[PDB]
PDB file of all heavy atoms in Angstrom:
ATOM      1  N   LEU A   1       0.806  -1.224   0.000  1.00 51.71           N
ATOM      2  CA  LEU A   1       0.000   0.000   0.000  1.00 51.71           C
ATOM      3  C   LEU A   1       0.843   1.280   0.000  1.00 51.71           C
ATOM      4  O   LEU A   1       0.296   2.384  -0.017  1.00 51.71           O
ATOM      5  CB  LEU A   1      -1.020  -0.005   1.159  1.00 51.71           C
ATOM      6  CG  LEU A   1      -2.143  -1.053   1.075  1.00 51.71           C
ATOM      7  CD1 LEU A   1      -3.018  -1.038   2.332  1.00 51.71           C
ATOM      8  CD2 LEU A   1      -3.018  -0.894  -0.164  1.00 51.71           C
ATOM      9  N   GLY A   2       2.165   1.127  -0.014  1.00 50.64           N
ATOM     10  CA  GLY A   2       3.096   2.264   0.072  1.00 50.64           C
ATOM     11  C   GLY A   2       2.986   3.087   1.354  1.00 50.64           C
ATOM     12  O   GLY A   2       3.092   4.311   1.310  1.00 50.64           O
ATOM     13  N   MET A   3       2.750   2.432   2.488  1.00 48.95           N
ATOM     14  CA  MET A   3       2.679   3.112   3.796  1.00 48.95           C
ATOM     15  C   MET A   3       4.023   2.977   4.548  1.00 48.95           C
ATOM     16  O   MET A   3       4.691   1.963   4.428  1.00 48.95           O
ATOM     17  CB  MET A   3       1.527   2.541   4.633  1.00 48.95           C
ATOM     18  CG  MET A   3       0.129   2.794   4.090  1.00 48.95           C
ATOM     19  SD  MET A   3      -1.114   1.636   4.725  1.00 48.95           S
ATOM     20  CE  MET A   3      -2.629   2.366   4.101  1.00 48.95           C
ATOM     21  N   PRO A   4       4.452   4.023   5.287  1.00 49.25           N
ATOM     22  CA  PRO A   4       5.767   3.976   5.941  1.00 49.25           C
ATOM     23  C   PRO A   4       5.774   3.366   7.346  1.00 49.25           C
ATOM     24  O   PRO A   4       6.834   3.033   7.869  1.00 49.25           O
ATOM     25  CB  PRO A   4       6.159   5.451   6.014  1.00 49.25           C
ATOM     26  CG  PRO A   4       4.831   6.171   6.199  1.00 49.25           C
ATOM     27  CD  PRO A   4       3.775   5.321   5.513  1.00 49.25           C
ATOM     28  N   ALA A   5       4.593   3.227   7.939  1.00 47.45           N
ATOM     29  CA  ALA A   5       4.475   2.720   9.301  1.00 47.45           C
ATOM     30  C   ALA A   5       3.175   1.946   9.489  1.00 47.45           C
ATOM     31  O   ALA A   5       2.324   1.917   8.601  1.00 47.45           O
ATOM     32  CB  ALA A   5       4.565   3.861  10.302  1.00 47.45           C
ATOM     33  N   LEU A   6       3.027   1.321  10.653  1.00 44.45           N
ATOM     34  CA  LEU A   6       1.934   0.384  10.886  1.00 44.45           C
ATOM     35  C   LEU A   6       1.837   0.006  12.360  1.00 44.45           C
ATOM     36  O   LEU A   6       2.733  -0.639  12.906  1.00 44.45           O
ATOM     37  CB  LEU A   6       2.115  -0.872  10.032  1.00 44.45           C
ATOM     38  CG  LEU A   6       0.860  -1.714   9.792  1.00 44.45           C
ATOM     39  CD1 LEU A   6       0.968  -3.055  10.503  1.00 44.45           C
ATOM     40  CD2 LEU A   6      -0.385  -0.965  10.241  1.00 44.45           C
ATOM     41  N   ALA A   7       0.745   0.411  13.000  1.00 46.37           N
ATOM     42  CA  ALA A   7       0.409  -0.080  14.330  1.00 46.37           C
ATOM     43  C   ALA A   7      -0.312  -1.422  14.257  1.00 46.37           C
ATOM     44  O   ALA A   7      -1.280  -1.577  13.513  1.00 46.37           O
ATOM     45  CB  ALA A   7      -0.439   0.940  15.074  1.00 46.37           C
ATOM     46  N   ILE A   8       0.166  -2.388  15.035  1.00 46.31           N
ATOM     47  CA  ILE A   8      -0.615  -3.544  15.366  1.00 46.31           C
ATOM     48  C   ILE A   8      -0.972  -3.418  16.853  1.00 46.31           C
ATOM     49  O   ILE A   8      -0.096  -3.235  17.708  1.00 46.31           O
ATOM     50  CB  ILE A   8       0.081  -4.853  15.047  1.00 46.31           C
ATOM     51  CG1 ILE A   8       0.315  -4.940  13.542  1.00 46.31           C
ATOM     52  CG2 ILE A   8      -0.828  -6.005  15.450  1.00 46.31           C
ATOM     53  CD1 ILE A   8       1.194  -6.104  13.103  1.00 46.31           C
ATOM     54  N   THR A   9      -2.275  -3.460  17.122  1.00 45.30           N
ATOM     55  CA  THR A   9      -2.817  -3.245  18.441  1.00 45.30           C
ATOM     56  C   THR A   9      -3.656  -4.459  18.806  1.00 45.30           C
ATOM     57  O   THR A   9      -4.839  -4.342  19.021  1.00 45.30           O
ATOM     58  CB  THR A   9      -3.700  -1.965  18.470  1.00 45.30           C
ATOM     59  OG1 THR A   9      -4.720  -2.086  17.480  1.00 45.30           O
ATOM     60  CG2 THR A   9      -2.886  -0.748  18.114  1.00 45.30           C
ATOM     61  N   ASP A  10      -3.031  -5.621  18.923  1.00 42.83           N
ATOM     62  CA  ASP A  10      -3.742  -6.818  19.345  1.00 42.83           C
ATOM     63  C   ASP A  10      -4.393  -6.685  20.704  1.00 42.83           C
ATOM     64  O   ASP A  10      -4.029  -5.823  21.511  1.00 42.83           O
ATOM     65  CB  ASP A  10      -2.838  -8.062  19.280  1.00 42.83           C
ATOM     66  CG  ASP A  10      -2.618  -8.558  17.845  1.00 42.83           C
ATOM     67  OD1 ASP A  10      -3.588  -8.541  17.083  1.00 42.83           O
ATOM     68  OD2 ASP A  10      -1.489  -8.965  17.487  1.00 42.83           O
ATOM     69  N   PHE A  11      -5.387  -7.528  20.942  1.00 40.15           N
ATOM     70  CA  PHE A  11      -6.208  -7.457  22.151  1.00 40.15           C
ATOM     71  C   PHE A  11      -5.466  -7.928  23.382  1.00 40.15           C
ATOM     72  O   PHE A  11      -5.226  -9.134  23.531  1.00 40.15           O
ATOM     73  CB  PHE A  11      -7.509  -8.253  22.001  1.00 40.15           C
ATOM     74  CG  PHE A  11      -8.416  -8.079  23.163  1.00 40.15           C
ATOM     75  CD1 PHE A  11      -9.128  -6.884  23.338  1.00 40.15           C
ATOM     76  CD2 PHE A  11      -8.553  -9.082  24.116  1.00 40.15           C
ATOM     77  CE1 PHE A  11      -9.946  -6.707  24.429  1.00 40.15           C
ATOM     78  CE2 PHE A  11      -9.377  -8.876  25.225  1.00 40.15           C
ATOM     79  CZ  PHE A  11     -10.052  -7.681  25.366  1.00 40.15           C
ATOM     80  N   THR A  12      -5.104  -6.969  24.249  1.00 37.36           N
ATOM     81  CA  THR A  12      -4.527  -7.224  25.560  1.00 37.36           C
ATOM     82  C   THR A  12      -3.250  -8.100  25.500  1.00 37.36           C
ATOM     83  O   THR A  12      -2.911  -8.790  26.474  1.00 37.36           O
ATOM     84  CB  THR A  12      -5.602  -7.780  26.566  1.00 37.36           C
ATOM     85  OG1 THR A  12      -6.818  -7.040  26.416  1.00 37.36           O
ATOM     86  CG2 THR A  12      -5.138  -7.672  28.017  1.00 37.36           C
ATOM     87  N   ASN A  13      -2.511  -8.023  24.393  1.00 38.51           N
ATOM     88  CA  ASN A  13      -1.231  -8.724  24.278  1.00 38.51           C
ATOM     89  C   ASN A  13      -0.287  -8.107  23.241  1.00 38.51           C
ATOM     90  O   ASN A  13      -0.710  -7.338  22.353  1.00 38.51           O
ATOM     91  CB  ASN A  13      -1.413 -10.240  24.027  1.00 38.51           C
ATOM     92  CG  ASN A  13      -1.862 -10.568  22.623  1.00 38.51           C
ATOM     93  OD1 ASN A  13      -1.191 -10.261  21.627  1.00 38.51           O
ATOM     94  ND2 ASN A  13      -2.974 -11.245  22.531  1.00 38.51           N
ATOM     95  N   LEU A  14       0.987  -8.451  23.401  1.00 39.40           N
ATOM     96  CA  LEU A  14       2.074  -8.087  22.473  1.00 39.40           C
ATOM     97  C   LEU A  14       2.775  -9.347  21.932  1.00 39.40           C
ATOM     98  O   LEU A  14       3.953  -9.309  21.550  1.00 39.40           O
ATOM     99  CB  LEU A  14       3.082  -7.148  23.156  1.00 39.40           C
ATOM    100  CG  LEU A  14       2.474  -5.863  23.690  1.00 39.40           C
ATOM    101  CD1 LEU A  14       3.473  -5.000  24.441  1.00 39.40           C
ATOM    102  CD2 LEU A  14       1.842  -5.084  22.552  1.00 39.40           C
ATOM    103  N   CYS A  15       2.017 -10.444  21.860  1.00 39.62           N
ATOM    104  CA  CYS A  15       2.500 -11.766  21.441  1.00 39.62           C
ATOM    105  C   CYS A  15       3.284 -11.783  20.121  1.00 39.62           C
ATOM    106  O   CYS A  15       4.258 -12.537  20.006  1.00 39.62           O
ATOM    107  CB  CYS A  15       1.332 -12.794  21.367  1.00 39.62           C
ATOM    108  SG  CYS A  15       0.499 -13.162  22.963  1.00 39.62           S
ATOM    109  N   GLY A  16       2.842 -10.985  19.140  1.00 40.27           N
ATOM    110  CA  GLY A  16       3.478 -10.925  17.823  1.00 40.27           C
ATOM    111  C   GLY A  16       4.449  -9.780  17.597  1.00 40.27           C
ATOM    112  O   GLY A  16       4.771  -9.446  16.436  1.00 40.27           O
ATOM    113  N   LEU A  17       4.915  -9.176  18.694  1.00 38.58           N
ATOM    114  CA  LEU A  17       5.720  -7.967  18.658  1.00 38.58           C
ATOM    115  C   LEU A  17       7.110  -8.193  18.087  1.00 38.58           C
ATOM    116  O   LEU A  17       7.569  -7.419  17.260  1.00 38.58           O
ATOM    117  CB  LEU A  17       5.840  -7.364  20.066  1.00 38.58           C
ATOM    118  CG  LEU A  17       6.632  -6.062  20.211  1.00 38.58           C
ATOM    119  CD1 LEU A  17       5.936  -4.992  19.379  1.00 38.58           C
ATOM    120  CD2 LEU A  17       6.682  -5.603  21.649  1.00 38.58           C
ATOM    121  N   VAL A  18       7.795  -9.228  18.566  1.00 40.07           N
ATOM    122  CA  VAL A  18       9.082  -9.632  18.020  1.00 40.07           C
ATOM    123  C   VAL A  18       8.969  -9.971  16.530  1.00 40.07           C
ATOM    124  O   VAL A  18       9.883  -9.693  15.760  1.00 40.07           O
ATOM    125  CB  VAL A  18       9.672 -10.830  18.841  1.00 40.07           C
ATOM    126  CG1 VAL A  18      11.009 -11.338  18.255  1.00 40.07           C
ATOM    127  CG2 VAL A  18       9.827 -10.444  20.327  1.00 40.07           C
ATOM    128  N   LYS A  19       7.860 -10.574  16.116  1.00 39.57           N
ATOM    129  CA  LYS A  19       7.640 -10.904  14.703  1.00 39.57           C
ATOM    130  C   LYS A  19       7.355  -9.661  13.857  1.00 39.57           C
ATOM    131  O   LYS A  19       7.768  -9.571  12.690  1.00 39.57           O
ATOM    132  CB  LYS A  19       6.474 -11.884  14.561  1.00 39.57           C
ATOM    133  CG  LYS A  19       6.891 -13.344  14.712  1.00 39.57           C
ATOM    134  CD  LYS A  19       5.643 -14.209  14.758  1.00 39.57           C
ATOM    135  CE  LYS A  19       5.998 -15.635  15.101  1.00 39.57           C
ATOM    136  NZ  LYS A  19       6.230 -15.796  16.569  1.00 39.57           N
ATOM    137  N   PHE A  20       6.624  -8.734  14.470  1.00 38.97           N
ATOM    138  CA  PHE A  20       6.313  -7.408  13.940  1.00 38.97           C
ATOM    139  C   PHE A  20       7.593  -6.643  13.604  1.00 38.97           C
ATOM    140  O   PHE A  20       7.799  -6.226  12.461  1.00 38.97           O
ATOM    141  CB  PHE A  20       5.445  -6.644  14.962  1.00 38.97           C
ATOM    142  CG  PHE A  20       4.819  -5.388  14.424  1.00 38.97           C
ATOM    143  CD1 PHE A  20       4.811  -5.107  13.044  1.00 38.97           C
ATOM    144  CD2 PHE A  20       4.225  -4.488  15.276  1.00 38.97           C
ATOM    145  CE1 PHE A  20       4.225  -3.935  12.557  1.00 38.97           C
ATOM    146  CE2 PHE A  20       3.653  -3.332  14.786  1.00 38.97           C
ATOM    147  CZ  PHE A  20       3.649  -3.071  13.427  1.00 38.97           C
ATOM    148  N   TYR A  21       8.451  -6.506  14.603  1.00 36.87           N
ATOM    149  CA  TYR A  21       9.743  -5.851  14.465  1.00 36.87           C
ATOM    150  C   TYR A  21      10.687  -6.459  13.420  1.00 36.87           C
ATOM    151  O   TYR A  21      11.264  -5.726  12.612  1.00 36.87           O
ATOM    152  CB  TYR A  21      10.415  -5.748  15.829  1.00 36.87           C
ATOM    153  CG  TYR A  21      10.063  -4.447  16.482  1.00 36.87           C
ATOM    154  CD1 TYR A  21       8.808  -4.261  17.068  1.00 36.87           C
ATOM    155  CD2 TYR A  21      10.971  -3.374  16.481  1.00 36.87           C
ATOM    156  CE1 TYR A  21       8.464  -3.060  17.641  1.00 36.87           C
ATOM    157  CE2 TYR A  21      10.645  -2.184  17.053  1.00 36.87           C
ATOM    158  CZ  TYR A  21       9.396  -2.032  17.647  1.00 36.87           C
ATOM    159  OH  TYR A  21       9.052  -0.844  18.215  1.00 36.87           O
ATOM    160  N   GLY A  22      10.823  -7.779  13.422  1.00 39.68           N
ATOM    161  CA  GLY A  22      11.525  -8.485  12.351  1.00 39.68           C
ATOM    162  C   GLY A  22      10.964  -8.277  10.948  1.00 39.68           C
ATOM    163  O   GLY A  22      11.718  -8.141  10.013  1.00 39.68           O
ATOM    164  N   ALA A  23       9.646  -8.259  10.795  1.00 40.27           N
ATOM    165  CA  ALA A  23       8.998  -8.075   9.489  1.00 40.27           C
ATOM    166  C   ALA A  23       8.982  -6.589   9.044  1.00 40.27           C
ATOM    167  O   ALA A  23       9.007  -6.266   7.834  1.00 40.27           O
ATOM    168  CB  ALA A  23       7.579  -8.632   9.543  1.00 40.27           C
ATOM    169  N   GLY A  24       8.915  -5.695  10.021  1.00 41.04           N
ATOM    170  CA  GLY A  24       9.080  -4.273   9.780  1.00 41.04           C
ATOM    171  C   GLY A  24      10.416  -3.858   9.187  1.00 41.04           C
ATOM    172  O   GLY A  24      10.453  -3.135   8.208  1.00 41.04           O
ATOM    173  N   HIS A  25      11.507  -4.289   9.801  1.00 41.11           N
ATOM    174  CA  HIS A  25      12.842  -4.059   9.285  1.00 41.11           C
ATOM    175  C   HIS A  25      12.952  -4.605   7.867  1.00 41.11           C
ATOM    176  O   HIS A  25      13.400  -3.903   6.965  1.00 41.11           O
ATOM    177  CB  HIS A  25      13.889  -4.717  10.202  1.00 41.11           C
ATOM    178  CG  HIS A  25      15.309  -4.596   9.707  1.00 41.11           C
ATOM    179  ND1 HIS A  25      16.081  -3.465   9.905  1.00 41.11           N
ATOM    180  CD2 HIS A  25      16.102  -5.477   9.038  1.00 41.11           C
ATOM    181  CE1 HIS A  25      17.278  -3.650   9.370  1.00 41.11           C
ATOM    182  NE2 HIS A  25      17.317  -4.860   8.835  1.00 41.11           N
ATOM    183  N   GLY A  26      12.511  -5.848   7.677  1.00 39.90           N
ATOM    184  CA  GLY A  26      12.548  -6.502   6.363  1.00 39.90           C
ATOM    185  C   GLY A  26      11.869  -5.756   5.228  1.00 39.90           C
ATOM    186  O   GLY A  26      12.372  -5.747   4.095  1.00 39.90           O
ATOM    187  N   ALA A  27      10.740  -5.127   5.542  1.00 38.79           N
ATOM    188  CA  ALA A  27       9.858  -4.445   4.560  1.00 38.79           C
ATOM    189  C   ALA A  27      10.075  -2.925   4.468  1.00 38.79           C
ATOM    190  O   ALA A  27       9.438  -2.249   3.668  1.00 38.79           O
ATOM    191  CB  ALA A  27       8.374  -4.744   4.885  1.00 38.79           C
ATOM    192  N   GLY A  28      10.983  -2.404   5.291  1.00 39.48           N
ATOM    193  CA  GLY A  28      11.211  -0.966   5.416  1.00 39.48           C
ATOM    194  C   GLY A  28      10.109  -0.202   6.139  1.00 39.48           C
ATOM    195  O   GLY A  28      10.076   1.028   6.067  1.00 39.48           O
ATOM    196  N   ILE A  29       9.232  -0.925   6.850  1.00 42.21           N
ATOM    197  CA  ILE A  29       8.048  -0.370   7.551  1.00 42.21           C
ATOM    198  C   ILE A  29       8.370  -0.124   9.037  1.00 42.21           C
ATOM    199  O   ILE A  29       8.972  -0.964   9.697  1.00 42.21           O
ATOM    200  CB  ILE A  29       6.804  -1.340   7.416  1.00 42.21           C
ATOM    201  CG1 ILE A  29       6.361  -1.509   5.960  1.00 42.21           C
ATOM    202  CG2 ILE A  29       5.638  -0.919   8.263  1.00 42.21           C
ATOM    203  CD1 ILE A  29       5.743  -0.277   5.327  1.00 42.21           C
ATOM    204  N   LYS A  30       7.976   1.024   9.562  1.00 42.25           N
ATOM    205  CA  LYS A  30       8.212   1.286  10.969  1.00 42.25           C
ATOM    206  C   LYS A  30       7.056   0.733  11.814  1.00 42.25           C
ATOM    207  O   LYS A  30       5.900   1.131  11.640  1.00 42.25           O
ATOM    208  CB  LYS A  30       8.464   2.793  11.240  1.00 42.25           C
ATOM    209  CG  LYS A  30       8.571   3.117  12.734  1.00 42.25           C
ATOM    210  CD  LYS A  30       8.876   4.574  12.990  1.00 42.25           C
ATOM    211  CE  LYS A  30       7.705   5.288  13.587  1.00 42.25           C
ATOM    212  NZ  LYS A  30       8.120   6.673  13.940  1.00 42.25           N
ATOM    213  N   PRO A  31       7.374  -0.200  12.733  1.00 41.72           N
ATOM    214  CA  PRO A  31       6.369  -0.753  13.640  1.00 41.72           C
ATOM    215  C   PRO A  31       5.951   0.254  14.734  1.00 41.72           C
ATOM    216  O   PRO A  31       6.798   0.974  15.275  1.00 41.72           O
ATOM    217  CB  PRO A  31       7.079  -1.966  14.253  1.00 41.72           C
ATOM    218  CG  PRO A  31       8.385  -2.146  13.437  1.00 41.72           C
ATOM    219  CD  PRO A  31       8.712  -0.783  12.977  1.00 41.72           C
TER     220      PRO A  31
END
């Protein structure tokens, strides 16, 4: 979508945060 950043706001957890950060760096997207 050509967006520079992306919030993931899962319900009452940060379970996918490490995966978020790894995939963010990979894609040039700021988590």
Side-chain angles (χ1 to χ4, degrees):
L1 293 175
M3 294 159 172
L6 200 248
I8 297 171
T9 56
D10 285 320
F11 186 74
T12 317
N13 74 60
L14 302 176
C15 296
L17 181 61
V18 177
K19 274 172 188 79
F20 192 12
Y21 268 77
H25 177 82
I29 297 291
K30 174 178 110 174

